[PDB]
Design a protein around this ligand. Structure first.
Ligand SMILES: COC[C@](CO)(OC[C@H]1O[C@@H](n2ncc3c(NC4CCCC4)nc(Cl)nc32)[C@H](O)[C@@H]1O)P(=O)(O)O
Ligand SMILES: [Ca+2]
Ligand SMILES: [Zn+2]
Ligand SMILES: [Zn+2]
Length: 525
């Protein structure tokens, strides 16, 4: 006899509580709009009516992405995940963005479902206040059977977030294996690994961790599809991706892109000993054909009223597509990156003396900090809400003083593991950089010219290693984020800076009509 489990899954929803446009920015024309929690509820309930054994899972990164999270700070996540009746959630890196206190009080205390992470260990005074609010695993009854769900979270979280000194992030495979063994001793033969470390780590967990039957993932925003994909997203593999484990088993691995646009849907046929016989399915595109649930929509509309206080009024126009996509901004020069850096430099114009045209000419911006495009095809209108999707973190753009050697090392770090779609890839202003990706990590920056400061005519000259340059960058990078530890450790000065969205808003308002280009700021030999 066979037992079929239906795994429903989301990952990297990123405050997209409402429905969105095709590129996950604000919904304009509702006929061509997608996702949101109300539409998700409808599809989940169809499948719960139709299929006997159903789990709705989240693989982290609900926190952070839109004005919803700016205002409600995770209370919206707790409320609407409770309304959808999620069966479990794994902690992502962005769940620690407002500290451990910003995780506990909004999300963990208000959640009426298990929140999971096995590789996070509390220390000192936190252990008491946090104990039981997150777990390493959960055994869940599904029909007659039980299904174990073991949690995991990225080891990189302290480089990406504010977990603080009282949490330790263990290796995933090291931490997961004891907990999966413990589930075997409790007669749990069906074990799902739900977590937030990326597709490559998902494949490694599937390969190495004995007992794990399915891996449900996030963080890398991985779209997988079997057959013709139903929208703009390009699949990185078949759904599910089959990893062959070290003990001979076929382990399906799944991810459901991002932004609540798709609902993941995998049907696993298990045998009586909890071995995967087969598995099939695809991520279901949550298009306008699927209606929003009236009661959830009405409740979204209630929480929406506070957000309509944000000004409707046009900040300015764009006549170009502002390419703030990850596929551009983490791999090459993107025009959204140029815009933001030009805005940053424009903000710091203080023409004080005859020697310098301006004291700062230079900008670096982590590409992973650019979180949305802005589409030009609604009369070119840019609103604050559109910019809030690009820059959702409530950060500042700060001035630092760096040695050229420190800057060189940052640009080496920018491409040290190029190809993985990680956020450390640097968008720039007043810097022309050339990479050679054939060369070894730490030796890929072949040309690095910078715009002169001590000059009346701005022009590009080679970066000198022992010269000190003033650079505008995000506070995230000033505090050593994205593994830019050389910046925090070697910086000579660090001033407080202006709020990130306001800087870019001011520039767009001053310029009125914008048309930023890709100009060869970043080249590859
Ligand atoms: C493998 O990609 C993972 C991911 C994909 O979308 O992107 C990671 C990239 O996101 C950027 N990031 N993360 C945090 C942060 C931040 N502020 C922090 C401190 C306080 C508030 C959080 N500020 C700025 Cl400007 N960027 C920030 C950074 O580039 C990082 O690699 P995911 O969102 O799944 O983690
Ligand atoms: Ca099993
Ligand atoms: Zn994410
Ligand atoms: Zn993440």
């Amino acid at each position: 006899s066979m037992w079929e489990l239906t795994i429903l899954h989301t990952n990297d929803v990123h405050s997209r509580l409402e429905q969105t446009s095709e590129d996950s920015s604000k919904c304009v024309d509702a006929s061509r709009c997608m996702g949101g929690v109300a539409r998700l509820f409808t599809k989940v309930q169809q499948i719960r009516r139709a299929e006997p054994n159903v789990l709705l899972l989240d693989a982290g990164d609900q926190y952070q992405g839109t004005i919803w999270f700016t205002v409600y700070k995770g209370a919206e996540v707790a409320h609407f995940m409770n309304a959808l009746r999620y069966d479990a959630m794994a902690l992502g890196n962005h769940e620690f963005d407002n500290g451990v206190e910003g995780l506990i009080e909004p999300l963990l205390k208000e959640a009426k479902f298990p929140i999971l992470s096995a590789n996070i260990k509390a220390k000192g005074p936190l252990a008491s206040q946090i104990s039981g609010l997150y777990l390493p695993y959960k055994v869940l009854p599904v029909g007659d059977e039980v299904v174990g769900i073991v949690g995991y979270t990225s080891k990189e979280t302290p480089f990406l977030s504010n977990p603080g000194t009282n949490l330790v992030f263990e290796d995933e495979i090291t931490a997961l294996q004891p907990e999966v063994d413990k589930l075997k001793t409790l007669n749990v033969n069906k074990i799902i690994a739900l977590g937030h470390s990326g597709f490559e780590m998902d494949k490694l967990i599937a390969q190495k961790v004995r007992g794990v039957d399915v891996v449900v993932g996030g963080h890398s925003n991985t779209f997988l599809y079997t057959g013709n994909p139903p929208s703009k997203e390009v699949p990185a593999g078949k759904y599910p991706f089959i990893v062959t484990s070290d003990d001979g088993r076929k382990v399906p691995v799944v991810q459901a892109y991002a932004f609540g646009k798709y609902l993941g849907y995998l049907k696993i046929e298990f045998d009586e000993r909890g071995n995967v016989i087969s598995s099939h399915g695809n991520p279901i595109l949550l298009n306008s054909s699927i209606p929003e649930d009236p009661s959830i929509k009405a409740d979204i509309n209630k929480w929406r009223i506070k957000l309509d206080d944000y000004s409707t009024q046009e900040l300015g126009k764009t006549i170009v597509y502002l390419d703030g996509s990850s596929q551009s901004c983490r791999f090459r020069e993107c025009n959204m990156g140029n815009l933001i850096c030009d805005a940053m430099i424009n903000n710091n114009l203080r023409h004080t003396d005859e020697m310098f045209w301006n004291h700062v000419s230079m900008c670096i911006l982590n590409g992973g900090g650019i979180r949305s495009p802005i589409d030009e095809r609604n009369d070119g209108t840019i609103t604050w809400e559109n910019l809030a999707a690009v820059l959702p973190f409530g950060g500042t753009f700060d001035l630092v003083q760096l040695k050229g050697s420190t800057l060189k090392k940052a640009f080496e770090h920018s491409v040290h593991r190029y190809g993985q779609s990680t956020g450390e890839f640097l968008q720039v202003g007043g810097i022309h950089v050339v990479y050679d990706l054939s060369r070894k990590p730490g030796d890929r920056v072949v040309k690095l010219d910078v715009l002169c400061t001590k000059c009346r005519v701005p022009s590009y000259d080679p970066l000198k290693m022992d010269e000190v340059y003033k650079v505008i960058l995000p506070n995230f990078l000033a505090n050593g984020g994205d593994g830019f530890q050389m910046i925090k450790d070697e910086l000579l000065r660090h001033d407080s800076g202006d709020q990130d969205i306001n800087v870019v808003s001011t520039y767009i308002s001053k310029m009125k009509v914008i048309y930023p280009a890709v100009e060869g700021r970043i080249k590859f030999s």
